[PDB]
Design a protein around this ligand. Structure first.
Ligand SMILES: *[C@@H]1O[C@H](CO)[C@@H](O[C@@H]2O[C@H](CO)[C@@H](O)[C@H](O)[C@H]2NC(C)=O)[C@H](O)[C@H]1NC(C)=O
Ligand SMILES: *[C@@H]1O[C@H](CO)[C@@H](O[C@@H]2O[C@H](CO)[C@@H](O)[C@H](O)[C@H]2NC(C)=O)[C@H](O)[C@H]1NC(C)=O
Ligand SMILES: *[C@@H]1O[C@H](CO)[C@@H](O[C@@H]2O[C@H](CO)[C@@H](O)[C@H](O)[C@H]2NC(C)=O)[C@H](O)[C@H]1NC(C)=O
Ligand SMILES: Cc1ccc(-c2ncc(Cl)cc2-c2ccc(S(C)(=O)=O)cc2)cn1
Ligand SMILES: [Fe+3]
Ligand SMILES: [Zn+2]
Ligand SMILES: [Zn+2]
Length: 341
């Protein structure tokens, strides 16, 4: 009744969710799916209530009648007086990242290189960079641009999955969930850091969180910020300190979506949940922290300060902005107004 079913994507998000369910006294319970698209389907069927989604997926869900409820809000030097829950969201920077030692690799020489993407249909990892690449080459053959890639969610037999590694045992190669070694912001950046690919399409924060001792994960332990360069659209290379002037776009934050008819109830429960397990929650350090999962970004990104109310009660279109929405529509016509399911 006053109970929310969260939808977890893959085994590890399932495990974190079960802990949260336990700690919440069953105020929250868990449904699990293998993919984000399958979680969207459970929500439409009314078998789950909610999940936190990247902007590219909000666009998928929004066409199907799902609505943004609360957005991820990270720390900011601006609006610093305003409480996190009421502070406007700032958006993240989509960047292209290379090794400094890979000299003379720039935006203009990306053709036939190796690429690392968060997953197909995601903002920084797919929609922004490929949309730019389609526009620039005047071609929809984006599956032919890079020699090899890890792009979780693409056909496991295509070059777009050639670089993906799967799990501990080599199973689940290229699945769009965290069982895939090179899935997500962290996975894509690991793909570049291990020199599997030449370029990673991630966000600004990913580089900072996985370098200079911020991680302690074995692959990231010894990574230094100075060994990385951002690719800018003017053909130039800059230090990772210069992302404000060398990004591909600003992305709308990840947000919680639900069926319109459930939005009010999902909102109320979630606000109470973060009071308990959020950043300064009554139980977070002590019993359970919603926004931690040791660099793995499970259910929520680890850099989330809070979930913020929206303001202007936006539709999914207003939430994403006319900039981003036209970008996705233009790319989607390479792959007609309907829910995909
Ligand atoms: C699970 O949900 C119930 C119902 O919302 C919570 O009980 C409320 O808790 C607040 C403060 O935390 C009390 O002041 C109210 O009297 C309760 N309201 C109702 C409607 O019973 C309960 O706290 C939640 N449990 C957990 C662990 O999250
Ligand atoms: C790129 O991302 C990093 C990491 O999120 C940002 O650096 C953080 O900035 C906040 C202040 O806004 C600091 O309190 C944190 O300590 C910083 N994080 C780390 C780990 O150093 C940085 O601002 C981002 N760059 C831009 C231009 O947005
Ligand atoms: C790729 O090209 C298309 C076509 O120009 C871009 O779509 C235009 O975007 C601008 C700015 O939002 C609008 O003023 C135009 O109305 C759009 N035209 C169309 C056909 O819708 C699209 O934004 C480009 N993709 C990327 C990622 O930059
Ligand atoms: C968080 C958020 C709120 C609103 C919007 C938005 N909704 C509609 C339209 Cl037409 C545009 C935008 C919008 C697009 C880009 C930028 S910027 C300058 O890159 O920060 C700001 C706002 C985009 N993001
Ligand atoms: Fe994203
Ligand atoms: Zn910009
Ligand atoms: Zn409106």
């Amino acid at each position: 009744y006053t109970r929310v079913v969260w939808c977890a994507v893959g085994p590890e998000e399932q495990k974190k969710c079960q802990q949260w369910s336990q700690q919440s006294g069953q105020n929250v319970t868990c449904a699990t799916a293998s993919t984000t698209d399958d979680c969207i389907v459970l929500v439409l069927k009314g078998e789950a209530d909610a999940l936190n989604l990247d902007g590219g997926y909000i666009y998928t869900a929004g066409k199907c009648g799902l609505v943004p409820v609360l957005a991820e809000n990270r720390k900011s030097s601006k609006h610093s007086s305003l409480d996190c829950v009421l502070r406007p969201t700032e958006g993240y920077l989509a960047v292209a990242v290379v090794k400094k030692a890979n000299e003379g690799l720039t935006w203009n020489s990306l053709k036939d290189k190796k690429s690392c993407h968060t997953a197909v249909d995601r903002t920084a990892g797919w929609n922004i960079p490929m949309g730019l690449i389609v526009n620039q080459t005047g071609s929809c053959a984006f599956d032919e641009f890079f020699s090899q890639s890890c792009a979780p969610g693409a056909d496991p037999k295509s070059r777009l999955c050639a670089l993906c590694a799967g799990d501990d045992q080599g199973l689940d190669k290229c699945v769009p969930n965290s069982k895939e070694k090179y899935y997500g912001y962290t996975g894509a950046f690991r793909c570049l850091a291990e020199d599997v690919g030449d370029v990673a399409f991630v966000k600004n924060d990913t580089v900072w969180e996985n370098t200079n001792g911020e991680s302690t994960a074995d692959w990231a332990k010894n990574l230094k910020r100075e060994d990385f360069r951002l690719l800018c659209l003017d053909g130039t290379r800059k230090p990772v300190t210069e992302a404000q002037s060398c990004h591909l776009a600003v992305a709308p934050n990840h947000a919680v979506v639900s069926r319109s008819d459930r939005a009010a109830h999902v909102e109320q429960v979630l606000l109470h949940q973060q009071a308990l397990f959020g950043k300064n929650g009554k139980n977070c350090p002590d019993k359970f922290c919603l926004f931690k999962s040791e660099t793995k970004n499970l259910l929520f990104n680890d850099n989330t300060e809070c979930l913020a109310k929206l303001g202007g009660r936006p539709t999914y279109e207003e939430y994403l902005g006319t900039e981003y929405v036209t970008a996705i529509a233009n790319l989607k016509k390479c792959s007609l107004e309907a829910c995909a399911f």
